[PDB]
Amino acid sequence: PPYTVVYFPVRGRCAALRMLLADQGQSWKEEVVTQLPKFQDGDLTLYQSNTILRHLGRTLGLYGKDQQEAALVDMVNDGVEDLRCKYISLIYTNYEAGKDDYVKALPGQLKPFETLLSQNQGGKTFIVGDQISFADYNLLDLLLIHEVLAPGCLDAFPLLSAYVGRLSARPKLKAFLASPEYVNLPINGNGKQ
Amino acid sequence: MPPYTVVYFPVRGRCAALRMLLADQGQSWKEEVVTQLPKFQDGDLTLYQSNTILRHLGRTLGLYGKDQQEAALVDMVNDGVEDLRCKYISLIYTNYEAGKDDYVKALPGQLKPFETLLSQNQGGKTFIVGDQISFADYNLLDLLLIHEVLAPGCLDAFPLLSAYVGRLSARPKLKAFLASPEYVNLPINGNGKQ
Ligand SMILES: [As]
Ligand SMILES: [As]
């Protein structure tokens, strides 16, 4: 249906959603605000990034092939959101004093995703099952912003590296990620990354 | 053995709602006590985190709306329940004595959106979303029950929420579970505060 995304003028908790829409060849309108995002799909109004991701998962079939996979998609997404919460708290609340210890902790925070990949067709497909889910887009965005926070952080992790390279190369997603609409938006809204 | 196992602390906490849901749906499960959680097993599937569990049971027991639109509305209601639950948890463990007066004065404004939801859905006479029970109902019921303990009479400002609690609490299987030692003899939280 007709989509509208309302958010602050940053990537933030909106980036994964946008990546998903772009890659899935959906059209949407952006409305700027100077819990979000607010999302409109016909007469339906949604708030909160994870609730929006799940909705798009159901409607566009990005939620696993069955009930069991759906639950696994949720658990992976929970793990993405736990790290993202720690990121947001670092960025907006303790960047200076906190960063050194955050980056120290970071390889331990990434390993579980590497292991998860290692248990799903040799890490050659997606984070859950044989087809992309909303968890993949969210995990990709998380990995990308961590590479800015800590360049080289995926170097020790070959499945996660190939995974980012592979998903980033899907042609609609690639075009989106190279575009100014993505590249020229700040990651967060306080100058920090 | 039961196909379900719940693994948690000896508290109600984040497990209360799913236990109520399982009891109300006439399901059998095993409790394992531990001195990420709760952990939930359903056959060889292992889940963590109360909301992911609730959603799993919503999908399998048909408690996730009648269609995709309702499913998303269930999720939003659930988000609301979890936001207030997160503030409650903050109060309980972090600032109970100095914070309680403030939290209770703010409580009306936190509760009002749920009352409004009910008033927009068949005059508050069925469930929080649609005409069938969902996992958000169980989660909201628990949040309301524990706020009645924190702030007795807090629902006197909310006629629809009051009747809703009375109505859901009277569902036979759930009623028996809520009166049972299994529920009554666990404390609401882990730090003695409520
Ligand atoms: As956090
Ligand atoms: As909170």
UniProtKB/Swiss-Prot annotation, chain A:
Q: Which GO terms describe its biological process?
A: animal organ regeneration; cellular response to cell-matrix adhesion; cellular response to epidermal growth factor stimulus; cellular response to glucocorticoid stimulus; cellular response to insulin stimulus; cellular response to lipopolysaccharide; central nervous system development; common myeloid progenitor cell proliferation
Q: Which residues carry this modification: Phosphothreonine?
A: 45
Q: Identify the main location.
A: cytoplasm
Residue numbers bearing the Phosphotyrosine modification: 3, 182
Q: Which residues carry this modification: N6-acetyllysine?
A: 111
Domain GST C-terminal residue range list: 66-187
Domain of life, per UniProt, equals: Eukaryota
Impact after mutating residue 7 to F: Reduces catalytic activity about 50-fold
- InterPro entries the UniProt entry points to: Glutathione-S-Trfase_C-like, Glutathione-S-Trfase_C_sf, Glutathione_S-Trfase, Glutathione_S-Trfase_N, GST_C, GST_pi, GST_superfamily, Thioredoxin-like_sf
What cystine linkages occur within this chain?
none
User: What EC number(s) would the UniProt record show?
Assistant: 2.5.1.18
Q: Could you cite one Gene Ontology molecular function of this protein?
A: nitric oxide binding
Q: What does this protein do?
A: Conjugation of reduced glutathione to a wide number of exogenous and endogenous hydrophobic electrophiles. Involved in the formation of glutathione conjugates of both prostaglandin A2 (PGA2) and prostaglandin J2 (PGJ2). Participates in the formation of novel hepoxilin regioisomers. Negatively regulates CDK5 activity via p25/p35 translocation to prevent neurodegeneration.
Assembly:
Homodimer. Interacts with CDK5.
Return the protein name. Glutathione S-transferase P
Q: Which organism's genome codes for this protein? A: Homo sapiens (Human)
Q: What is the lineage of its organism?
A: Eukaryota, Metazoa, Chordata, Craniata, Vertebrata
